[PDB]
RNA sequence: GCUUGACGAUCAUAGAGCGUUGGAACCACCUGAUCCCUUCCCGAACUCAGAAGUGAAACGACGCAUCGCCGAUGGUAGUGUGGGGUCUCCCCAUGUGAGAGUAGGUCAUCGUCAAGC
RNA sequence: CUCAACGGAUAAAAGGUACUCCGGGGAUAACAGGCUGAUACCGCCCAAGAGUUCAUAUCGACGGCGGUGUUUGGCACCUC
RNA sequence: UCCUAAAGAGUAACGGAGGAGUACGAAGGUGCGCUCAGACCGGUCGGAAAUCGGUCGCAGAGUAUAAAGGCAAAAGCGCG
RNA sequence: ACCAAACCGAUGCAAACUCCGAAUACCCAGAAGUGCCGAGCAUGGGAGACACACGGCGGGUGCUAACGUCCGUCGUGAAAAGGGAAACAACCCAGACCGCCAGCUAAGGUCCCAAAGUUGUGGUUAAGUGGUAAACGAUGUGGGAAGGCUUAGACAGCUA
């Protein structure tokens, strides 16, 4: 009947773009259910949050069947 | 049916709008089977005589690019929607042997006296026009004559009723459909 | 070679971005002519601020 | 009048009315048409004032198509009401016209009986509408 | 490169449909279920013991653009900065430039060994 | 600890003033002005029709474009 | 949770629409298996519809709970 | 003789609909030049502010009404004088250290108030348009490209 009541905007998005250099446990993408899949050396935590495990450069490559988006980190 | 052209070595948006107000020209292209596409300027006055002609759409037109001559058939008319006038033309080279689909007008030649008109309630409603073609360019169908002087009331006309004379096919019969053409019904 | 430029408009109603393209060339005020080393990245600043300038060669 | 049967929502934004009309500017069914050369918006009672003008200057036959359909609800606040206590109720329905759009089509009549019939329907519409033929 | 298997590379120009075709090597159906083992019932599936038969089915190759899928050139829509006008909308200079549609394409291309030439 | 006035004044809290009072404010209302014209008012375009025939002697349904600031408003720029 | 929100984050209105103040000792872990809805044909008391068999499917089903974003190593279903 | 799923063909439209899809804006790296001699970051001392205003471009609301009102982003006022718009915080031009009876320019201008062309060239417009306004009406006029008939006699008028 009356309607205000929004929420407080959880600050999602994609950090660490296509040519960065990452540390051991950085946050790559704050996902909301797998826009991006776990590529070569990344983690996929509890609420589908991609994080690194090794060092290098982010790739953002599209692979395979289903055309899914794979975030791999390359030792380069 | 004859028209002469030029070369148009200036592309883009800005150079393509100065043509239409300074010199009154219309852009075009000539793309075909064995050659490259070639852009072209034409005048708005000379296309106006051809577009006013009846069967000029389903007909071979010669083109003088420079002194270059080519038998050219027209399949597009981009047209200005607001005021109403011609924009760029986009026609086609004609090879002496190629399959060459195009579009053909209709006429409905004999409907002054029909069985549904003079006996029953008289209405004839033309649904379709501009039926396509798929024919070698050695024989050009300028038009197709359809006769509805004998079809009674309550009957419709499919595409199988009218015919395509002397080596002409119909693409809609090459698919699994047969579109209705004309109806005869009762007025209200 | 080089090319000389001439600041022919004022800087006091402009953006925060054209006002730094002109300062990157080295122009301080109106009717002030400098020489630039005509690299591909020094003539990229000229293409932004083309209307404040008189590129008289 | 002409309005949807049921709607997924109830009220809608205003928006704008930009651009020309590239799809909608070609005559498809009839052989004469009344296309619109000025932008505006039609309020679904003007359509019935213009339909009932064409359907009594013929009285013999022909066939009429109505190419445009209003689906955009508009609001109106009541009187002696200050501003800001919500949003007003839906009073009527609006189609949005932009230059080139074809409004009515006719066929099965003469070339000049129809020409003086769209003169009647143009005097009920708030737009500058022209006369066009099938090619 | 040709033959069949295994594992990949690349994800439709590699798909679907139709047609055609293969053995005694491979593979598949097949024969039994006593002996492992299995079925909310059932040797269907799972598994074991095998070589009576077959290439039907399946599976590979080989053809067809009929559906699908890719897709030019030109024009057009929109838009950054600077100016305009009759200023709820557009226009000029300049940089940028789709989507849709058209001409046409497509019955994929490779790599690693093991058994065949 | 429905401390839900959800960063939570205290273990523990309802109302009247036309008998009124002090400090302020045109950061804010009622009167008149200002900008606006939905409404109001005088008009004008198509003309189904009735005026026994005959749309325009007089009216004119369905709808459309303007003018004046005259009353019902909208806003809160001036003056507490 | 969505829209306004201008293709990074953020962002107002007494702006348009909806939900929560919980369940669960398996509705958790693991190993092993397995696919939907719907249409249609045939089949006794059911019949537009129950259970069974069949082809067609190509996720249009499902997700303890709103909507959004997801799901074939199925994040969906069964067993130890 | 009404009606009507579903399917085929043509045909339109959504802020809470997407098979698609830019310009810009954002990030990170590698370089040349310029920075008024610094631009950045960190630690300390001292504050003021937390009533905003208009204009341009995207929007909500409103009647796509208000110098209305709530946002996004640049600009000006606030805290900026000078020249222009007759006078006109917020629009165009340009940012005042002081002195000069010195010169060249910007927007705006050049008959007289009023500083500078009664300048040159090619046409238009007779209404004081210029120097306020809509549907709509009309042998106003200038230009353009096509037509319709015509010395076999057209169009007008005068006679049957
Ligand atoms: Mg300043
Ligand atoms: Mg394209
Ligand atoms: Mg008393
Ligand atoms: Mg007092
Ligand atoms: Mg006040
Ligand atoms: Mg005040
Ligand atoms: Mg965003
Ligand atoms: Mg943005
Ligand atoms: Mg679960
Ligand atoms: Mg599994
Ligand atoms: Mg959208
Ligand atoms: Mg405060
Ligand atoms: Mg405040
Ligand atoms: Mg204000
Ligand atoms: Mg205010
Ligand atoms: Mg100074
Ligand atoms: Mg001088
Ligand atoms: Mg003087």
mmCIF file with all atom_site columns, N, CA, C and O (backbone and C1' of nucleotides) and ligand atoms in Angstrom, chain G residues 27-28 63-64 75-77, ligand 9:
data_model
loop_
_atom_site.group_PDB
_atom_site.id
_atom_site.type_symbol
_atom_site.label_atom_id
_atom_site.label_alt_id
_atom_site.label_comp_id
_atom_site.label_asym_id
_atom_site.label_entity_id
_atom_site.label_seq_id
_atom_site.pdbx_PDB_ins_code
_atom_site.Cartn_x
_atom_site.Cartn_y
_atom_site.Cartn_z
_atom_site.occupancy
_atom_site.B_iso_or_equiv
_atom_site.pdbx_formal_charge
_atom_site.auth_seq_id
_atom_site.auth_comp_id
_atom_site.auth_asym_id
_atom_site.auth_atom_id
_atom_site.pdbx_PDB_model_num
ATOM   1  P  P     . A   G 1 27 ? 16.295 -35.142 5.768  1.00 0.00 ? 27 A   G P     1
ATOM   2  O  "O5'" . A   G 1 27 ? 17.340 -34.456 4.783  1.00 0.00 ? 27 A   G "O5'" 1
ATOM   3  C  "C5'" . A   G 1 27 ? 16.898 -33.742 3.630  1.00 0.00 ? 27 A   G "C5'" 1
ATOM   4  C  "C4'" . A   G 1 27 ? 17.476 -32.347 3.559  1.00 0.00 ? 27 A   G "C4'" 1
ATOM   5  C  "C3'" . A   G 1 27 ? 18.475 -31.990 4.655  1.00 0.00 ? 27 A   G "C3'" 1
ATOM   6  O  "O3'" . A   G 1 27 ? 19.405 -31.032 4.151  1.00 0.00 ? 27 A   G "O3'" 1
ATOM   7  C  "C1'" . A   G 1 27 ? 16.606 -30.560 4.805  1.00 0.00 ? 27 A   G "C1'" 1
ATOM   8  P  P     . G   G 1 28 ? 20.793 -31.494 3.495  1.00 0.00 ? 28 G   G P     1
ATOM   9  O  "O5'" . G   G 1 28 ? 21.880 -31.223 4.622  1.00 0.00 ? 28 G   G "O5'" 1
ATOM   10 C  "C5'" . G   G 1 28 ? 22.532 -29.970 4.723  1.00 0.00 ? 28 G   G "C5'" 1
ATOM   11 C  "C4'" . G   G 1 28 ? 23.703 -30.035 5.666  1.00 0.00 ? 28 G   G "C4'" 1
ATOM   12 C  "C3'" . G   G 1 28 ? 24.888 -30.856 5.203  1.00 0.00 ? 28 G   G "C3'" 1
ATOM   13 O  "O3'" . G   G 1 28 ? 25.721 -30.155 4.307  1.00 0.00 ? 28 G   G "O3'" 1
ATOM   14 C  "C1'" . G   G 1 28 ? 24.373 -31.439 7.412  1.00 0.00 ? 28 G   G "C1'" 1
ATOM   15 P  P     . U   G 1 63 ? 10.926 -27.176 -5.344 1.00 0.00 ? 63 U   G P     1
ATOM   16 O  "O5'" . U   G 1 63 ? 12.415 -26.780 -4.973 1.00 0.00 ? 63 U   G "O5'" 1
ATOM   17 C  "C5'" . U   G 1 63 ? 13.340 -27.759 -4.520 1.00 0.00 ? 63 U   G "C5'" 1
ATOM   18 C  "C4'" . U   G 1 63 ? 14.712 -27.171 -4.340 1.00 0.00 ? 63 U   G "C4'" 1
ATOM   19 C  "C3'" . U   G 1 63 ? 14.772 -26.039 -3.325 1.00 0.00 ? 63 U   G "C3'" 1
ATOM   20 O  "O3'" . U   G 1 63 ? 15.892 -26.192 -2.467 1.00 0.00 ? 63 U   G "O3'" 1
ATOM   21 C  "C1'" . U   G 1 63 ? 15.634 -25.309 -5.417 1.00 0.00 ? 63 U   G "C1'" 1
ATOM   22 P  P     . A   G 1 64 ? 15.676 -26.102 -0.880 1.00 0.00 ? 64 A   G P     1
ATOM   23 O  "O5'" . A   G 1 64 ? 14.095 -26.013 -0.685 1.00 0.00 ? 64 A   G "O5'" 1
ATOM   24 C  "C5'" . A   G 1 64 ? 13.361 -27.098 -0.126 1.00 0.00 ? 64 A   G "C5'" 1
ATOM   25 C  "C4'" . A   G 1 64 ? 12.365 -26.643 0.915  1.00 0.00 ? 64 A   G "C4'" 1
ATOM   26 C  "C3'" . A   G 1 64 ? 11.860 -25.215 0.788  1.00 0.00 ? 64 A   G "C3'" 1
ATOM   27 O  "O3'" . A   G 1 64 ? 10.789 -25.102 -0.134 1.00 0.00 ? 64 A   G "O3'" 1
ATOM   28 C  "C1'" . A   G 1 64 ? 12.480 -25.655 3.034  1.00 0.00 ? 64 A   G "C1'" 1
ATOM   29 P  P     . A   G 1 75 ? 26.350 -31.238 -7.871 1.00 0.00 ? 75 A   G P     1
ATOM   30 O  "O5'" . A   G 1 75 ? 25.634 -30.204 -6.901 1.00 0.00 ? 75 A   G "O5'" 1
ATOM   31 C  "C5'" . A   G 1 75 ? 24.218 -30.158 -6.816 1.00 0.00 ? 75 A   G "C5'" 1
ATOM   32 C  "C4'" . A   G 1 75 ? 23.730 -29.032 -5.939 1.00 0.00 ? 75 A   G "C4'" 1
ATOM   33 C  "C3'" . A   G 1 75 ? 22.366 -28.485 -6.327 1.00 0.00 ? 75 A   G "C3'" 1
ATOM   34 O  "O3'" . A   G 1 75 ? 21.632 -28.116 -5.165 1.00 0.00 ? 75 A   G "O3'" 1
ATOM   35 C  "C1'" . A   G 1 75 ? 24.005 -26.775 -6.519 1.00 0.00 ? 75 A   G "C1'" 1
ATOM   36 P  P     . G   G 1 76 ? 20.610 -29.167 -4.506 1.00 0.00 ? 76 G   G P     1
ATOM   37 O  "O5'" . G   G 1 76 ? 19.641 -29.580 -5.697 1.00 0.00 ? 76 G   G "O5'" 1
ATOM   38 C  "C5'" . G   G 1 76 ? 18.436 -28.876 -5.942 1.00 0.00 ? 76 G   G "C5'" 1
ATOM   39 C  "C4'" . G   G 1 76 ? 17.534 -29.623 -6.892 1.00 0.00 ? 76 G   G "C4'" 1
ATOM   40 C  "C3'" . G   G 1 76 ? 17.184 -31.043 -6.494 1.00 0.00 ? 76 G   G "C3'" 1
ATOM   41 O  "O3'" . G   G 1 76 ? 16.129 -31.109 -5.556 1.00 0.00 ? 76 G   G "O3'" 1
ATOM   42 C  "C1'" . G   G 1 76 ? 17.864 -31.019 -8.745 1.00 0.00 ? 76 G   G "C1'" 1
ATOM   43 P  P     . C   G 1 77 ? 16.089 -32.287 -4.469 1.00 0.00 ? 77 C   G P     1
ATOM   44 O  "O5'" . C   G 1 77 ? 15.941 -33.619 -5.326 1.00 0.00 ? 77 C   G "O5'" 1
ATOM   45 C  "C5'" . C   G 1 77 ? 14.672 -34.183 -5.603 1.00 0.00 ? 77 C   G "C5'" 1
ATOM   46 C  "C4'" . C   G 1 77 ? 14.796 -35.615 -6.062 1.00 0.00 ? 77 C   G "C4'" 1
ATOM   47 C  "C3'" . C   G 1 77 ? 15.314 -36.601 -5.031 1.00 0.00 ? 77 C   G "C3'" 1
ATOM   48 O  "O3'" . C   G 1 77 ? 14.326 -37.052 -4.127 1.00 0.00 ? 77 C   G "O3'" 1
ATOM   49 C  "C1'" . C   G 1 77 ? 16.479 -36.915 -7.050 1.00 0.00 ? 77 C   G "C1'" 1
HETATM 50 MG MG1   . LIG I 2 .  ? 19.474 -28.865 -1.416 1.00 0.00 ? 9  LIG I MG1   1
#
